[PDB]
Each structure stands twice: as structure tokens, then as C-alpha cells.
Amino acid sequence: MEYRPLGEEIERIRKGKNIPLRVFDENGVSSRSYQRFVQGNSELRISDLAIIVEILSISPMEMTEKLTPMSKTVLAKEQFNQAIFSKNFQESSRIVADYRAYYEKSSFALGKQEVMYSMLALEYLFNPQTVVTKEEIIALENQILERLINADVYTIFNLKFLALQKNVGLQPFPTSLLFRVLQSVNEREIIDIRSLEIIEQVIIDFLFAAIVSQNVPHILHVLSMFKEYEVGENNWRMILWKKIAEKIEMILTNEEIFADWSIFKEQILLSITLFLPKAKQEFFAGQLEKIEDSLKEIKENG
Amino acid sequence: QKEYMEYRPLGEEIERIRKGKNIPLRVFDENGVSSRSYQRFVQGNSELRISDLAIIVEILSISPMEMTEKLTPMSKTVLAKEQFNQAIFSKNFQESSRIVADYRAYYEKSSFALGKQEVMYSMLALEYLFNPQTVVTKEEIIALENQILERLINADVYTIFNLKFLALQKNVGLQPFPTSLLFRVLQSVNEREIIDIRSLEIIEQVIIDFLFAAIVSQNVPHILHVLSMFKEYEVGENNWRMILWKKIAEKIEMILTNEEIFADWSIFKEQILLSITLFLPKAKQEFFAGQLEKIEDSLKEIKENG
């Protein structure tokens, strides 16, 4: 049984904090069942675990990659991810074939479906002698897309799916769907740094692409969404993007002049020397230039 | 015997996702999870097992992170701490003081848990700090404080709530601050990959306060210990605020080690002050500027003393 990361980590805390097993029994929790849980044996109940994190004064958020369970799907995706990274492709293609069989015989699970698509997509993108076909990707893509369209709630993995779908680019990107996914995901407070990083990059890229497209109604739609996106006080990068978005709206609606844009852009270009290495600096600068050019064209061509 | 764990939020949230994703209860049974136990769980009845939950997050394609605050049970301790916090915030102090007295009784009769101990100290400390009509005495805060400190001295792993405890103990200031202990706690906590913005927010504020206080104290060996700690603290590329505090620490280092002069501080400070117009509202801008002012003055006193 795989919840071993969690049990091992709880063990590490308990022992590091000098808490003897008897305390668990004094609180209504079988030290035996707990021990069997640490190993690879029997099954703990959530209420037991909650009593344990209160005993050990653990914040549950604190448990990070320890809250994720180590199922066949999760382990498979871990292997395939590192394999693809290190470019050891014989492994990646064999993990794919194995998982294809497992999935086709397994009970239905959205996680399994999503990981299945992920494996096919990354194979198609990175293994130059891949067996997986465009057609297999598209059929599975359309199943996931159909569920997304008919759904009323979205989670972070639906956003990852859309990002991956844009990179695969075998079918046009569902922009309207991106709006709905962003809205449902950002209804809750995101506390996963990894999720925040995905959401931020998607929003920055979405606004940049909207601008270069010079489609004003769409740019305004993206800006209106960015207006509702909540940014923490300490998230200076996102604060700055919010300020850029604000200044862009004024320019688009004729309520700011390009001389003011120019002053603002120069301030930014100076300030990012504090925060960014040189390559990131020039990439950012280039983004500002292309945005400036797009706006010049929009306002010249009315 | 064991205490009741209120878990309807978790069940209601899993319900929300399942229904929002068009997953019929039948699918849970195809995957090894008793739909009947699950429904009993969504209600106010029986206890779900960890393995059932794991299967459910795979069915629903959930990142377990995505729940976090629903994975926490509404225990007497959790509800009490939530209540007391918001009561203290809105300055409605009749509430806070009665939550305190109740919890003290509950804690004194309860079985032992470090969590209960920590919340107990949090409540006494915030009463004493914020309720100008508090019943809580110094001596009680001190007794409990010393129990928690003793456990901290004897431990070899620390968690984020130990850090919160140290920040709060410095604020209470009824006893000297254990600076060596703060170094060990920061070290142990930052051994993990902290993935939670909430913990990151507490750690960042502690180390910023730690460096500001070190400078204000003008005690150079201590300051140098804090700067080398800062130098080793890892921050993501997109954490611009922390990028900047690392650079501030770096510049302070150079002036103290005679590899840059006060003029270099002044140039750097003005560049920062121009940049923070982009990131900070006026109030945060002025607070930040004031911190740079007090740092500069301290640096000038140190350099005219040595």
C-alpha cells in the first residue's frame, strides 16, 4: 500500500518531536493501526489522521507531495515524466504502452483519462520515434473536451490539460473554454505555489496573445477577466502585470496617451534590472515592445 | 472516547466537484469505494478511510492540494481557533475572552496534543496583546511558553507552527527571544520544499523581520549570521519581493565587509525606491521607504562606530 510518503513523513515528525505511541492511544487512535498504516498494511480513517495531525501540531497544508497518493497512475506518470525529461525514450514509450493497456482494462477515472492524454501528448511532442498517432490523441482530446464543455466545475488539472492542448496544437484552441476554466478555478483561493505558477503564466500568455492578435473585443474580454483576478500584496510580478493591463485598457479606450505609456515602459524596463536575470530581462523588454507596436497599430487603424 | 471530527465540508466539496463533473455515484463503486459509506460520509454519519479518499481524488481528477482547507476537520480546536481569530480581528472582545476561558477548561481536561497546546498559547498571547480588558495573566503565558520552549529545545524536527509560535513569542516579549532556536527552526522548515503560499508568507515575514531587527540592533556578528542565512535561502524566480530582499541583504553585507561604501547604498536605495512605485500602493510604499530609512541610519551608526 502506497500512502507510504504520508506515513513516513508523519513518522519523521512524531519521532523528531518526541511523541511516544501511547499518546495516540490516549487520544482514541490505535497505535497499532497507525503503525500498520506507516508500513504497507491496513487503512486509516480520515478522522484518525486528523486527530494525529492535531497531536503532532501539523498544518495539513504543510504536507505537500505527501498528500498525493502513490497509485499505479501516479507512479506511472512520475516515471514517464522523469524519463521524458532525461530523454531516455525507450522507457517513456514502454510506460505509455503499459499504461494504455492498464487504462483500457481499468475502471473509469478522470485522473486516468487525463494522465493517459498527458502521456500521449508528451510522447507525440518529444519522442522522435514515437508510436502514438495524431488520431489517437485527437479522439481522446475530443472526449476530454466534451466532458469539459458539459461540465459546470473545473479544477487545476483541467487548466493543465488546456495548456498541454495548446502545445500539442492538433486542433484549434478552445478560447471560450479557457475563460470558463479560469473562472471556476479562481473562484477558490489558490494556495498551491505550483498551481499559482501555472495560472499566472497562462494569464500572462493569454493577454499577450490577445494583444498581438489586435482583436480589440477579445483583448477587452481578457482585460476584464484579469481585472477580476485577485493578486496578493507580495506578488509584485503579478501586481505589475495588473498595472500593465490597466494602462493598456486606458490606451485602448482613449483615456491615456502614448507619451504616458512610454514613460511607464521606461520605468518598467529600468526596474526589472532588480528582479530579473539578463535573458529574462530582454524577453520581458521584447514583450513590452511587441505590445507597444500592437497598440500603436490598433490606435492608428481605428 | 475519541473526539468527534466534523467532516461535512470535505464531503460537500467532493459532492460539489463530483456533481459539477457529471460523475455518477455508480463510478465510485466501479472503482472500489462504497457509495453507501460515501453518502453516509457526506451527511453527518460514518468515517471515510484514506484509501477511499485516494481513489476518489483519482476518479475526480483532483489535486489534493486543491482541497487543503476542506481536508482540515472542524474540531473543537480548529473551530475555536478560527472563531477566536476573527473575534479578535473585529475587536469584539467579549467573544474572544469567553472563547479563551472555555478553551482553557477544555485543554486542561483534554488528552495531550501539541496542537492544543499551541492554540492555547496563541489565545493567551493574543488576548494579552489585544484585549485591553483581558483576564489572562503574564504568569500563565510564561508557564505555558516555557513548556513549549522546552519541547522546542528537545526536538530535532520543526514545523511551520513552531515558527508561528516564535514570531508570536517575540511579539509577546514577556521573556527573552531564543535566537539560536530561531536559526534551527528556520533551517528545519526550509529543508522541505514549501509548496503552500500560507507557510511561505509566514517564513518570508519572519526572516524580513529578523534581518530588520538585526540591523536595528547594530550588533555586527549577529547581523552577519542573519545575512549568511539570507544568502542561503532559496527563492523562486517569480518571487520578486524576496529577490529584492536578498539583494538588500547582499548590499548590507558589502558595506559591513568594506567592499562597498555608503554612497553605493544610497545609489541602490534610490533605484529601489523608484522601482517600488510599480508594485506598492502609497501606504506600503511609505512603510517600505521608512524601513530603508531606519536601515540606512543604523548602517551609518555602525560605520561611525567601526
Side-chain angles (χ1 to χ4, degrees):
Chain A
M1 155 232 109
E2 249 75 89
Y3 251 120
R4 278 179 76 100
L6 194 65
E8 163 179 71
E9 179 60 15
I10 291 166
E11 260 311 274
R12 187 199 149 245
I13 300 332
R14 184 189 110 260
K15 292 201 64 89
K17 286 187 177 198
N18 301 318
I19 294 306
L21 288 177
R22 51 157 180 93
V23 173
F24 284 24
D25 302 295
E26 301 168 344
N27 275 267
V29 178
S30 159
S31 64
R32 339 220 317 159
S33 283
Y34 165 75
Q35 282 167 106
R36 263 200 189 106
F37 164 65
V38 174
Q39 332 249 26
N41 269 246
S42 77
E43 252 105 69
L44 194 68
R45 304 165 282 191
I46 304 167
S47 72
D48 293 321
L49 186 59
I51 284 160
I52 291 169
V53 314
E54 183 162 290
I55 283 155
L56 304 177
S57 203
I58 292 174
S59 167
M61 78 210 173
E62 196 149 28
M63 314 285 87
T64 154
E65 296 123 24
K66 314 302 182 171
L67 304 171
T68 299
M70 236 65 31
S71 61
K72 182 138 179 77
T73 297
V74 171
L75 281 150
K77 180 204 191 166
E78 184 165 276
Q79 255 95 89
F80 174 92
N81 279 352
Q82 242 268 8
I84 286 279
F85 168 77
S86 323
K87 293 192 127 194
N88 135 58
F89 287 110
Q90 297 268 39
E91 260 303 79
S92 79
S93 42
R94 168 211 138 252
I95 304 169
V96 168
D98 166 289
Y99 200 81
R100 189 188 330 269
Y102 173 77
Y103 170 73
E104 254 141 23
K105 192 62 106 69
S106 279
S107 45
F108 183 82
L110 298 170
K112 298 210 198 102
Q113 183 172 65
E114 228 108 14
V115 166
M116 180 74 269
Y117 179 83
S118 185
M119 271 168 188
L120 305 172
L122 294 174
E123 275 278 306
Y124 181 83
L125 263 148
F126 288 120
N127 189 344
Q129 53 173 257
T130 192
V131 92
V132 304
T133 67
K134 286 167 38 209
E135 291 74 31
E136 202 193 334
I137 294 174
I138 285 166
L140 180 57
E141 204 172 283
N142 286 340
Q143 287 161 53
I144 298 169
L145 283 170
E146 194 67 12
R147 299 194 149 273
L148 283 180
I149 288 160
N150 296 323
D152 333 297
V153 178
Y154 306 94
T155 51
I156 189 62
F157 292 152
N158 305 134
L159 193 49
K160 298 190 165 169
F161 166 83
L162 287 179
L164 182 65
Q165 194 280 351
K166 195 184 211 119
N167 289 345
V168 173
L170 287 175
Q171 299 191 113
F173 181 79
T175 302
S176 150
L177 202 47
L178 183 61
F179 285 112
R180 310 179 48 200
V181 169
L182 286 172
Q183 162 80 56
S184 171
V185 162
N186 298 311
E187 278 172 14
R188 182 193 67 85
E189 27 112 84
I190 309 290
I191 71 130
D192 188 343
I193 262 94
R194 285 167 317 175
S195 290
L196 274 189
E197 171 170 28
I198 285 151
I199 296 169
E200 288 167 4
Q201 201 48 56
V202 166
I203 280 170
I204 291 168
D205 292 348
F206 195 27
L207 174 71
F208 183 77
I211 298 177
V212 305
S213 86
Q214 304 189 20
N215 174 359
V216 174
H218 179 54
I219 297 162
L220 297 172
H221 198 180
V222 179
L223 293 175
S224 177
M225 182 265 297
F226 208 12
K227 249 131 58 160
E228 292 197 304
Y229 184 77
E230 278 170 307
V231 168
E233 266 184 56
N234 298 331
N235 192 348
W236 291 6
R237 182 177 70 131
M238 292 313 287
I239 291 160
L240 171 67
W241 275 105
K242 284 200 91 184
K243 287 190 192 273
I244 298 173
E246 265 164 58
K247 187 77 65 183
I248 285 174
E249 191 171 323
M250 301 289 260
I251 287 165
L252 284 177
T253 65
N254 302 306
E255 287 187 31
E256 196 42 275
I257 54 175
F258 273 105
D260 179 87
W261 170 261
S262 284
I263 294 304
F264 174 72
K265 185 190 98 193
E266 286 304 327
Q267 302 179 5
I268 290 175
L269 286 178
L270 270 51
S271 309
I272 64 181
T273 64
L274 299 184
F275 308 112
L276 293 190
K278 205 83 187 59
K280 293 323 199 100
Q281 213 158 130
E282 59 192 23
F283 181 76
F284 196 96
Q287 285 185 304
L288 298 176
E289 292 328 292
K290 311 193 179 151
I291 282 157
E292 180 169 330
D293 295 338
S294 293
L295 305 177
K296 304 271 209 222
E297 284 206 50
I298 290 173
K299 297 319 276 172
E300 141 203 349
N301 285 299
Chain B
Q1 259 295 313
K2 117 208 286 265
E3 283 203 78
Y4 172 53
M5 296 307 133
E6 181 56 64
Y7 255 118
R8 282 184 81 102
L10 192 64
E12 169 155 38
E13 180 60 14
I14 291 166
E15 263 315 276
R16 188 194 78 84
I17 298 171
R18 177 188 77 80
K19 289 204 251 146
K21 285 185 180 194
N22 303 315
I23 295 304
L25 287 175
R26 162 270 280 183
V27 174
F28 283 24
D29 297 295
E30 302 169 344
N31 277 272
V33 177
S34 160
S35 132
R36 167 263 325 167
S37 283
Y38 167 77
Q39 283 167 285
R40 185 153 294 109
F41 165 67
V42 177
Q43 215 61 39
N45 269 246
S46 77
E47 337 250 72
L48 194 69
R49 305 211 243 106
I50 309 298
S51 74
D52 291 319
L53 184 60
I55 287 161
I56 286 170
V57 312
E58 183 164 282
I59 285 155
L60 301 180
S61 202
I62 290 176
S63 166
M65 268 306 138
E66 207 151 35
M67 236 91 287
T68 289
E69 70 284 348
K70 310 299 183 169
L71 307 169
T72 299
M74 249 158 58
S75 63
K76 181 60 180 283
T77 297
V78 173
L79 281 150
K81 178 205 201 173
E82 186 90 281
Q83 245 102 73
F84 173 92
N85 279 352
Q86 182 67 263
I88 286 278
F89 167 82
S90 56
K91 295 143 307 192
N92 131 61
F93 289 109
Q94 313 91 314
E95 252 299 86
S96 78
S97 43
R98 72 147 203 103
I99 302 171
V100 165
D102 166 287
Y103 198 80
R104 181 174 19 230
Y106 168 77
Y107 168 72
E108 245 137 68
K109 71 155 189 280
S110 281
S111 45
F112 186 82
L114 302 171
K116 300 211 199 101
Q117 184 172 67
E118 258 136 272
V119 166
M120 177 74 147
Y121 181 86
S122 186
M123 275 170 186
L124 305 173
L126 293 174
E127 272 279 308
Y128 180 89
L129 255 18
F130 290 117
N131 187 343
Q133 290 169 219
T134 192
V135 169
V136 179
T137 169
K138 286 183 305 220
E139 291 75 29
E140 207 195 338
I141 297 172
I142 284 167
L144 182 59
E145 204 172 283
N146 291 342
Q147 285 162 279
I148 297 173
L149 283 169
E150 254 290 319
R151 298 196 148 275
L152 284 181
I153 290 158
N154 297 322
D156 353 87
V157 314
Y158 308 94
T159 50
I160 190 63
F161 289 154
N162 305 133
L163 199 52
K164 298 202 326 183
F165 168 80
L166 289 178
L168 182 62
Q169 192 275 352
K170 182 100 131 156
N171 290 346
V172 172
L174 285 175
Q175 300 195 115
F177 184 77
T179 298
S180 300
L181 191 44
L182 183 63
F183 284 112
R184 312 178 47 196
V185 168
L186 283 170
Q187 158 79 54
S188 168
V189 161
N190 295 309
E191 276 174 14
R192 184 209 302 290
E193 213 53 289
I194 307 97
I195 252 88
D196 28 338
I197 250 304
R198 283 182 208 115
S199 287
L200 221 45
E201 164 172 22
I202 119 108
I203 299 165
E204 290 170 6
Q205 201 49 54
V206 167
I207 65 170
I208 290 165
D209 290 347
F210 193 29
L211 171 67
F212 184 77
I215 299 173
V216 161
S217 85
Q218 307 189 22
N219 177 10
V220 171
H222 176 51
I223 297 159
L224 296 174
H225 199 183
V226 179
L227 295 177
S228 76
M229 187 264 298
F230 240 95
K231 184 152 234 119
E232 293 190 43
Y233 182 76
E234 278 168 347
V235 352
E237 51 174 344
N238 297 330
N239 192 350
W240 290 7
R241 185 175 71 134
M242 292 319 289
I243 294 303
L244 180 68
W245 277 105
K246 283 196 89 180
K247 288 189 193 275
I248 290 169
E250 213 184 282
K251 186 76 63 188
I252 287 166
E253 190 176 87
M254 250 101 260
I255 285 160
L256 289 178
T257 66
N258 297 307
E259 278 213 321
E260 279 212 353
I261 50 178
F262 216 76
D264 310 321
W265 169 257
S266 285
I267 294 167
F268 173 71
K269 188 190 102 195
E270 201 245 351
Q271 294 188 9
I272 286 178
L273 286 179
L274 273 175
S275 310
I276 66 178
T277 286
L278 301 180
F279 310 110
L280 293 185
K282 316 90 229 298
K284 288 197 67 77
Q285 213 162 318
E286 289 160 32
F287 182 73
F288 198 78
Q291 280 183 300
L292 296 175
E293 292 326 298
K294 312 192 177 149
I295 282 156
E296 188 168 333
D297 292 334
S298 293
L299 220 49
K300 117 87 130 176
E301 282 205 49
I302 294 172
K303 295 314 274 174
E304 63 179 311
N305 265 64

